[PDB]
Design an enzyme around this catalytic site. Structure first.
Site, PDB file in Angstrom:
ATOM      1  N   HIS A 131       3.463  -5.103 -13.754  1.00  0.00           N
ATOM      2  CA  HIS A 131       3.304  -6.514 -13.418  1.00  0.00           C
ATOM      3  C   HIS A 131       3.519  -7.502 -14.559  1.00  0.00           C
ATOM      4  O   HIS A 131       3.184  -8.667 -14.422  1.00  0.00           O
ATOM      5  CB  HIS A 131       1.919  -6.746 -12.797  1.00  0.00           C
ATOM      6  CG  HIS A 131       1.672  -5.938 -11.562  1.00  0.00           C
ATOM      7  ND1 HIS A 131       2.396  -6.115 -10.401  1.00  0.00           N
ATOM      8  CD2 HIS A 131       0.792  -4.940 -11.309  1.00  0.00           C
ATOM      9  CE1 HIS A 131       1.955  -5.274  -9.479  1.00  0.00           C
ATOM     10  NE2 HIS A 131       0.984  -4.550 -10.007  1.00  0.00           N
TER      11      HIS A 131
ATOM     12  N   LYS B 253       8.974   0.800  -3.859  1.00  0.00           N
ATOM     13  CA  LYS B 253       7.777  -0.014  -3.660  1.00  0.00           C
ATOM     14  C   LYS B 253       8.125  -1.205  -2.769  1.00  0.00           C
ATOM     15  O   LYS B 253       9.120  -1.893  -3.012  1.00  0.00           O
ATOM     16  CB  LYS B 253       7.210  -0.483  -5.000  1.00  0.00           C
ATOM     17  CG  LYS B 253       5.854  -1.160  -4.876  1.00  0.00           C
ATOM     18  CD  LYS B 253       5.119  -1.215  -6.206  1.00  0.00           C
ATOM     19  CE  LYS B 253       3.793  -1.968  -6.023  1.00  0.00           C
ATOM     20  NZ  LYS B 253       3.024  -2.112  -7.288  1.00  0.00           N
TER      21      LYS B 253
ATOM     22  N   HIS C 237      -5.334  -4.397 -12.173  1.00  0.00           N
ATOM     23  CA  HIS C 237      -4.835  -4.450 -10.809  1.00  0.00           C
ATOM     24  C   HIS C 237      -4.353  -5.863 -10.529  1.00  0.00           C
ATOM     25  O   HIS C 237      -5.034  -6.825 -10.879  1.00  0.00           O
ATOM     26  CB  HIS C 237      -5.971  -4.096  -9.837  1.00  0.00           C
ATOM     27  CG  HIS C 237      -5.661  -4.374  -8.398  1.00  0.00           C
ATOM     28  ND1 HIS C 237      -4.755  -3.631  -7.673  1.00  0.00           N
ATOM     29  CD2 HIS C 237      -6.156  -5.304  -7.544  1.00  0.00           C
ATOM     30  CE1 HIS C 237      -4.701  -4.094  -6.435  1.00  0.00           C
ATOM     31  NE2 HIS C 237      -5.536  -5.114  -6.333  1.00  0.00           N
TER      32      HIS C 237
END
Length: 120
Positions: free
Chosen positions: A11, A38, A112
């Site tokens: 990310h 993904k 996350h």
């Protein structure tokens, strides 16, 4: 340790080139996110300092169940899978954006990214 490193791999992209469909197709491949493809994945741009800071009062508020939402806005790019198959080649449609982000933090580090806010 490893989860933060994993977060960055998935990310974070400091100084992205362009941010069009081909940008997504390439970076999703580089970061090992295409086997299988993904379905949706968002990269945050800029410096790492500002992202870690979402884990403190400095740049974040508590959010929902044990998440944190940034005060500042980030340049981001969302890569969304299109086509039928779950396996490579993976074709991605890129959506660049600018807004706050939601993460979960552990020991002061993001581990996350909440992808829900970048759908639709």
């Amino acid at each position: 340790n490893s989860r933060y490193t994993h977060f960055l791999t998935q990310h974070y992209d400091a100084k992205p080139q362009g941010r069009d469909d081909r940008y997504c197709e390439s970076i999703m491949r580089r970061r090992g996110l295409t086997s299988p493809c993904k379905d949706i994945n968002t990269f945050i741009h800029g410096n790492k300092r500002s992202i870690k800071a979402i884990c403190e009062n400095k740049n974040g508020n508590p959010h929902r169940e044990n998440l944190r939402i940034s005060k500042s806005s980030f340049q981001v790019t969302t890569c969304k899978l299109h086509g039928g198959s779950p396996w490579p080649p993976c074709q991605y449609r890129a959506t660049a954006g600018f807004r706050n982000v939601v993460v979960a933090c552990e020991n002061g580090l993001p581990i996350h990214l909440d992808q829900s806010i970048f759908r639709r």
